[PDB]
Amino acid sequence: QVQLVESGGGLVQPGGSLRLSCAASGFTFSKYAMNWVRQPPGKGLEWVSGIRPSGDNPTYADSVEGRFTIIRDNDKKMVYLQMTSLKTEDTAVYYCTRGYGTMTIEGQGTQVTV
Amino acid sequence: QVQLVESGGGLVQPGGSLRLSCAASGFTFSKYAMNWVRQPPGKGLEWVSGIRPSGDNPTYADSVEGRFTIIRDNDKKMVYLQMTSLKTEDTAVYYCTRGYGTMTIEGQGTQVTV
Amino acid sequence: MNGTEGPNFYVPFSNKTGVVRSPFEAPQYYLAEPWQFSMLAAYMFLLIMLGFPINFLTLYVTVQHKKLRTPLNYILLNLAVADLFMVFGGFTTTLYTSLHGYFVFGPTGCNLEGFFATLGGEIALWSLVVLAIERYVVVCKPMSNFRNHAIMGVAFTWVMALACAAPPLVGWSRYIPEGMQCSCGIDYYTPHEETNNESFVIYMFVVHFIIPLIVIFFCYGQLVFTVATTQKAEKEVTRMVIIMVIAFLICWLPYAGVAFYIFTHQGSDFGPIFMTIPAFFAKTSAVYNPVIYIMMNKQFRNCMVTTLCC
Amino acid sequence: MNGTEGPNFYVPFSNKTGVVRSPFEAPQYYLAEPWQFSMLAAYMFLLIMLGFPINFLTLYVTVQHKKLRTPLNYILLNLAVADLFMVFGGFTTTLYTSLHGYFVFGPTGCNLEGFFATLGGEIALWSLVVLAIERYVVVCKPMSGENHAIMGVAFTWVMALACAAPPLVGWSRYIPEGMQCSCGIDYYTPHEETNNESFVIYMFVVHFIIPLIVIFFCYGQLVFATTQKAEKEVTRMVIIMVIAFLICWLPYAGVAFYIFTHQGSDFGPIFMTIPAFFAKTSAVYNPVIYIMMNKQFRNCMVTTLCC
Numbered sequence: 001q002v003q004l005v006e007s008g009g010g011l012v013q014p015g016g017s018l019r020l021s022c023a024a025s026g027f028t029f030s031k032y033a034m035n036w037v038r039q040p041p042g043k044g045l046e047w048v049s050g051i052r053p054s055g056d057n058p059t060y061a062d063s064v065e066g067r068f069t070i071i072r073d074n075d076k077k078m079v080y081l082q083m084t085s086l087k088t089e090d091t092a093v094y095y096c097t098r099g100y101g102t103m104t105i106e107g108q109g110t111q112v113t114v
Numbered sequence: 115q116v117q118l119v120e121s122g123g124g125l126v127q128p129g130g131s132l133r134l135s136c137a138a139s140g141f142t143f144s145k146y147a148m149n150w151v152r153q154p155p156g157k158g159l160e161w162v163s164g165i166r167p168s169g170d171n172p173t174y175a176d177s178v179e180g181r182f183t184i185i186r187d188n189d190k191k192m193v194y195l196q197m198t199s200l201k202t203e204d205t206a207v208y209y210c211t212r213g214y215g216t217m218t219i220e221g222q223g224t225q226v227t228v
Numbered sequence: 229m230n231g232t233e234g235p236n237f238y239v240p241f242s243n244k245t246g247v248v249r250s251p252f253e254a255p256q257y258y259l260a261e262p263w264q265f266s267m268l269a270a271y272m273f274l275l276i277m278l279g280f281p282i283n284f285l286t287l288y289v290t291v292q293h294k295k296l297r298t299p300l301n302y303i304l305l306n307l308a309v310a311d312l313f314m315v316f317g318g319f320t321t322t323l324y325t326s327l328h329g330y331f332v333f334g335p336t337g338c339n340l341e342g343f344f345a346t347l348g349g350e351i352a353l354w355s356l357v358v359l360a361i362e363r364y365v366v367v368c369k370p371m372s373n374f375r376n377h378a379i380m381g382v383a384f385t386w387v388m389a390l391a392c393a394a395p396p397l398v399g400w401s402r403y404i405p406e407g408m409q410c411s412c413g414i415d416y417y418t419p420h421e422e423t424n425n426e427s428f429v430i431y432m433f434v435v436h437f438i439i440p441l442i443v444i445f446f447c448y449g450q451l452v453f454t455v456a457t458t459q460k461a462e463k464e465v466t467r468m469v470i471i472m473v474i475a476f477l478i479c480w481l482p483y484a485g486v487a488f489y490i491f492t493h494q495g496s497d498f499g500p501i502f503m504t505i506p507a508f509f510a511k512t513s514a515v516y517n518p519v520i521y522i523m524m525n526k527q528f529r530n531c532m533v534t535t536l537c538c
Numbered sequence: 539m540n541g542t543e544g545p546n547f548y549v550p551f552s553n554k555t556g557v558v559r560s561p562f563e564a565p566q567y568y569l570a571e572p573w574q575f576s577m578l579a580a581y582m583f584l585l586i587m588l589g590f591p592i593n594f595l596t597l598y599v600t601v602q603h604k605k606l607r608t609p610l611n612y613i614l615l616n617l618a619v620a621d622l623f624m625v626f627g628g629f630t631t632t633l634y635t636s637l638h639g640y641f642v643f644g645p646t647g648c649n650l651e652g653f654f655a656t657l658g659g660e661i662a663l664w665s666l667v668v669l670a671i672e673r674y675v676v677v678c679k680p681m682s683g684e685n686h687a688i689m690g691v692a693f694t695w696v697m698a699l700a701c702a703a704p705p706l707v708g709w710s711r712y713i714p715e716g717m718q719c720s721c722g723i724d725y726y727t728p729h730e731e732t733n734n735e736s737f738v739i740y741m742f743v744v745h746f747i748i749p750l751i752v753i754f755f756c757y758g759q760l761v762f763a764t765t766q767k768a769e770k771e772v773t774r775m776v777i778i779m780v781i782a783f784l785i786c787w788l789p790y791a792g793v794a795f796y797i798f799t800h801q802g803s804d805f806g807p808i809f810m811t812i813p814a815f816f817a818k819t820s821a822v823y824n825p826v827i828y829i830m831m832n833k834q835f836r837n838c839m840v841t842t843l844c845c
C-alpha cells in the first residue's frame with residue numbers, strides 16, 4: 001500500500017523562498033525516479049522538476065530553470081524542492097510523482113501561495 | 115439553378131388555421147417527392163409531413179397526425195400544407211424540402227407563430 | 229416515408245422514429261444487428277485474403293514466363309491487374325467501413341469503394357467481350373489467313389470500363405452507399421437531376437451491360453453448328469470462356485437485377501438487407517475469375533508450380 | 539526526462555516540449571514521420587498476407603494426409619497452429635494500430651499484440667527444444683513417433699503459457715514498445731507493483747537461456763537411402779530452423795536486455811521498433827523451411843494443391 005507524504009509549503013511573499021518535502025512509503029524508493037508537479041489555479045498541471053533514481057542528473061522546466069532545485073535522500077526516502085526567488089505565477093498546489101510521469105499518486109499536496 | 119418559394123404563413127391565434135405554400139422552380143418537379151419541415155424555437159428540426167411524387171400516399175408525424183394535411187400540384191409546381199386546429203408548440207419556421215430528407219434548400223421559410 | 233434521402237446518401241429505413249443518421253457521420257447499427265456488420269467485415273476479409281495471392285501470383289507467373297503470351301493469358305493478366313485494384317482500391321475501404329459501420333473516411337471513401345468495384349466488373353465484362361470475339365475469330369475464321377491484337381483488346385477494356393466508373397466521379401451520376409451502407413454503387417435511388425443519374429443508369433445498363441451480352445451471345449450464336457494442339461487449345465480455351473461467362477452471370481445478375489428493381493421502384497418499401505446481399509456477393513469478382521484460369525486451364529497450372537516450387 | 543513513463547505506457551521521447559501523449563489516447567506521429575507508420579502497416583500487411591496461406595496450407599496438408607506423422611511434422615504443424623494464432627490474434631491488432639498510430643482498441647488491444655507474439659516465439663523456441671532432443675535420441679541412441687511427439691507438443695504449449703500468460707495475470711505486463719505500435723514485456727519500467735523486473739530475469743534465463751543450453755547440449759552430442767537421408771536432412775533442417783531463430787529473435791532479445799539494464803537512458807522509438815517488427819517474421823519463416831528444405835512434404839503439398 002503506497003503512500004507519499006507532501007510536507008513543507010504554505011504562504012510566502014513574492015521573491016521569497018520555500019523548501020518542499022515528499023516522504024515515500026511502501027515501495028523500493030531508490031529503484032524508481034521521482035518528480036515534482038504543480039497545479040496552477042485554472043491552468044493545467046506543469047511538470048516542474050525531475051531526477052534520476054540514483055539522483056545524479058536533475059532536470060528542470062524552462063519556467064523554473066535555476067531558481068528551483070531538486071534533491072533526494074535515498075536512505076531516508078525523501079525528495080526535496082528548494083524553491084528560491086519565487087514569483088506570483090508559481091502560486092499552485094505541488095505534488096511529487098513517481099517514475100517520469102505527471103500522474104500523481106494521491107497526496108496531501110501543499111498549498112504554495114505566492 | 116434550383117429555387118423553392120415559401121409562400122403563406124404569419125401570425126395566427128391558438129386553435130386557428132393556416133394554409134402554407136411551396137412553389138418549385140428549376141427542376142423536374144413531378145419526378146420526385148416533397149416534404150414539410152419546421153424549426154421550433156430552441157429545439158431541432160421536425161419532419162412534419164411528406165408525400166410521394168405522384169401524390170397518392172401522404173404521411174404525417176405523430177405530432178401533427180390528422181390535424182395537418184399535405185397536398186401537391188404537379189401541373190403548377192406547388193406543395194400546400196393545410197394546418198388546422200393549431201397549438202402553441204406548432205410555433206416554428208416552416209420549410210419544404212426535396213426528396214425524403216430534412217436538408218432544406220434556400221431558407222427563411224415562413225414565420226408561423228401561434 | 230419509406231427510405232431516408234440525404235445530400236450524399238439514401239438510407240433504406242424510415243426516419244419516423246428519428247433514429248436515422250447519415251452513413252458518413254455516424255454508424256448504421258439500427259439498420260441491422262451489430263454482428264451482421266462484423267459478418268460483412270469477416271466475409272470481406274476473406275475476399276482480400278484470398279484475393280491478393282491469387283491475383284499477384286497469376287500476374288507474376290504470366291510476366292515472369294516469356295511463354296504464355298496467348299490472348300487468353302493477356303486478358304487473364306489484365307483481370308489480375310484490375311482484381312488487385314479491387315482488393316487494394318475498393319475492398320480495403322469496405323473492410324474498414326464494415327468494421328466501423330459507416331464510411332468514416334467520408335464521401336471520397338465511398339467513391340473508392342464504388343469506383344474500383346465498378347471497374348473490376350466492367351473490365352471483367354469487356355474482357356469477356358474480347359474473349360467472345362477472340363474465340364469467334366479462331367473457330368469460324370471470318371478473315372482468311374489470319375490468327376498485338378490482344379494488347380489492343382486490353383486497351384479496349386480499360387477504355388470502356390473508365391467510360392462507366394469515371395463519370396460518377398466527374399459529375400454525371402454519383403457513388404452512393406447501398407443496403408447496409410457499407411458498400412457503394414451507382415445512384416439507382418435518388419434521381420438527383422443535378423447529377424443526372426437517371427440518364428446514366430439507362431446508359432450503364434444498355435451500353436455497359438446489355439450491349440456486351442448481345443455481342444457475347446451473338447458470337448456464341450456463331451458457334452452453334454460447331455458446338456492434339458488445335459483440337460484441345462480450341463476446345464478447352466473456348467470452353468473456359470463459356471465457364472468464365474457462366475460464373476459472371478451467376479455473380480453480377482443478382483446485383484444488376486436488384487439495381488434495376490430499385491431504379492424502377494424508387495422510394496418503395498425495401499430494407500437494407502435487400503441490396504447488401506447481392507452487392508457483397510458480387511465482390512467475388514476479384515477471386516473467381518483467376519480460380520478458373522488455374523482450375524480449368526492446366527497449361528498455366530503447370531507453369532504456376534514452376535514459379536512456386538522452383 | 540529522457541523517456542515518458544505513464545500508468546500503462548512508456549514513451550521513449552522526452553516530454554519537455556509538452557507534446558507527448560498516451561499511446562492509447564492519441565496518435566504518436568511526433569515520435570517519427572507519419573509515412574514511417576504506414577511503412578509498418580505496409581510491412582505488417584505482408585506478414586499477415588503471406589502468413590495465413592503458408593500456415594493454413596501446411597496445417598491442411600499435414601492433417602489431410604494420414605501419412606506424414608513423424609515428430610518433425612507434428613511440431614511443424616504445432617508451429618503452423620501457433621503461427622495462425624499470431625496472424626489473427628496479434629498481427630491484426632498491430633496492423634490496425636500501425637495505421638491509426640496508436641492502440642485505439644485500448645490496454646487490452648496491447649495485450650493481444652504482445653500475448654500471441656510472445657507465444658509464437660516461445661512455442662517456436664520450446665519446439666526447437668523438442669526437436670533438439672528428438673534428433674539427439676535418434677542419432678546417439680540412448681534408448682534401444684505419434685506418442686512422444688504429441689506429448690512434446692503439449693510441452694511447448696505448457697511452457698509458452700508460463701511465459702505469455704503471467705503478464706495478463708499480474709506478474710509483469712504488456713506495454714507498447716518503440717513507435718508504440720507493437721507491445722512486449724516491460725523492460726523499460728520496473729513497475730515494482732507488477733514486479734516485471736523479476737519476470738525479465740525469469741524470462742531471459744528460464745524461458746530463453748535454459749533452452750539454448752539444452753539445444754547446444756544436444757548439438758554438442760553430435761560433434762563426433764532412407765536412414766542416411768531421413769537422419770541427415772531432417773537433423774540438418776533442425777539446425778537451419780535454429781539458425782533462422784537466432785537471426786530472428788536475437789535483435790529483439792538483445793535490445794530488450796539493453797533497455798532492461800539502461801532503464802531511463804537516451805534511446806529513441808526507432809531503436810526497439812526495428813528488431814521488434816523484424817521478429818514478427820516468426821510467423822512465416824519457419825514453415826518456409828519445411829517446404830524449402832524438406833522435399834518430402836513439398837511433394838505431398840502439391841498433391842493437396844494440384845489434385
Ligand SMILES: *[C@@H]1O[C@H](CO)[C@@H](O[C@@H]2O[C@H](CO)[C@@H](O[C@@H]3O[C@H](CO[C@H]4O[C@H](CO)[C@@H](O)[C@H](O)[C@@H]4O)[C@@H](O)[C@H](O[C@H]4O[C@H](CO)[C@@H](O)[C@H](O)[C@@H]4O[C@@H]4O[C@H](CO)[C@@H](O)[C@H](O)[C@H]4NC(C)=O)[C@@H]3O)[C@H](O)[C@H]2NC(C)=O)[C@H](O)[C@H]1NC(C)=O
Binds near residue numbers: 233243247248
Ligand atoms: C432523421 O430524423 C432525426 C430526428 O427526427 C433528425 O435529427 C435532427 O436533425 C436536425 C438537423 O437536420 C437537428 O436540428 C438541429 O439542431 C441544432 C441544435 O439542436 C441541438 O440542441 C437541442 C437543444 O435545444 C437538442 O434538443 C437537439 O437534439 C440538438 O442536440 C440547431 O442548431 C440546428 O438548427 C440551427 O442551425 C441551422 C444551421 O445553421 C440553421 O439553418 C437553423 O435555422 C438553426 O438556426 C436557428 O435558426 C432560427 C431561425 O432563423 C434562429 O432564430 C436561431 O437563432 C438559430 N439558432 C441559434 C439559437 O443560433 C438544427 O435545427 C435535430 O437536433 C436532430 N434531432 C435529434 C435526433 O436530436 C435527422 O436529421 C434525420 N436524418 C436525416 C438527415 O435524414
Ligand SMILES: *[C@@H]1O[C@H](CO)[C@@H](O[C@@H]2O[C@H](CO)[C@@H](O[C@@H]3O[C@H](CO[C@H]4O[C@H](CO)[C@@H](O)[C@H](O)[C@@H]4O)[C@@H](O)[C@H](O[C@H]4O[C@H](CO)[C@@H](O)[C@H](O)[C@@H]4O)[C@@H]3O)[C@H](O)[C@H]2NC(C)=O)[C@H](O)[C@H]1NC(C)=O
Binds near residue numbers: 542553558
Ligand atoms: C506531457 O506533458 C504535457 C504537458 O502539458 C501533459 O499535458 C498536461 O496533462 C495534465 C494532466 O493532468 C493536464 O492537466 C489537467 O488539465 C485539465 C484541464 O485541461 C484542459 O483545460 C485547460 C484550461 O486551463 C487547457 O489549458 C488544456 O489544454 C485542456 O484543454 C484540468 O481540469 C485538470 O485538473 C483536474 O484534474 C487534476 C488531476 O490531477 C486535479 O488535480 C485538479 O484538481 C482538477 O480536478 C488537470 O490540471 C494538462 O492540461 C495538460 N496540458 C495540456 C497541454 O493541456 C501530458 O499529460 C504529458 N504526457 C502524458 C500523456 O503523460
Ligand SMILES: *[C@@H]1O[C@H](CO)[C@@H](O[C@@H]2O[C@H](CO)[C@@H](O[C@@H]3O[C@H](CO)[C@@H](O)[C@H](O)[C@@H]3O)[C@H](O)[C@H]2NC(C)=O)[C@H](O)[C@H]1NC(C)=O
Binds near residue numbers: 166171173495498
Ligand atoms: C412504401 O412502400 C409501399 C410498398 O411498396 C408503397 O405502397 C404502395 O402504395 C401505392 C399508393 O397507395 C399503391 O398504389 C395503388 O395500388 C393499388 C393496388 O395495387 C391500385 O389499385 C392503385 O391504383 C394504386 O396504384 C401500391 O400498390 C402500394 N404497393 C403495395 C402493393 O404495397 C408505398 O407507396 C411507399 N410509400 C411511399 C411514401 O410512397
Ligand SMILES: *[C@@H]1O[C@H](CO)[C@@H](O[C@@H]2O[C@H](CO)[C@@H](O)[C@H](O)[C@H]2NC(C)=O)[C@H](O)[C@H]1NC(C)=O
Binds near residue numbers: 057
Ligand atoms: C539520458 O541519457 C543520457 C545518456 O545515457 C544520460 O547521460 C548520462 O548521465 C550519467 C549521470 O546521470 C553520466 O554518468 C553519463 O556519463 C551520461 N552519459 C553521457 C556520456 O551522455 C542522462 O543522465 C539521461 N537523463 C535522464 C535524467 O534520464
Ligand SMILES: *C/C=C(C)/C=C\C=C(C)\C=C\C1=C(C)CCCC1(C)C
Binds near residue numbers: 480
Ligand atoms: C460492392 C460494390 C459494388 C458492387 C459497386 C458497384 C457495382 C456496379 C456499379 C455494378 C454494375 C454492373 C456491373 C459491374 C456488371 C454488369 C451489370 C452492371 C452494369 C449493373
Ligand SMILES: *C/C=C(C)/C=C\C=C(C)\C=C\C1=C(C)CCCC1(C)C
Binds near residue numbers: 818
Ligand atoms: C511484435 C511483438 C512482440 C515482439 C511481442 C513480444 C515478444 C516477446 C515478449 C519476446 C521475447 C522473447 C521471445 C519470444 C523469443 C526468445 C527471446 C525472448 C524471451 C526475449
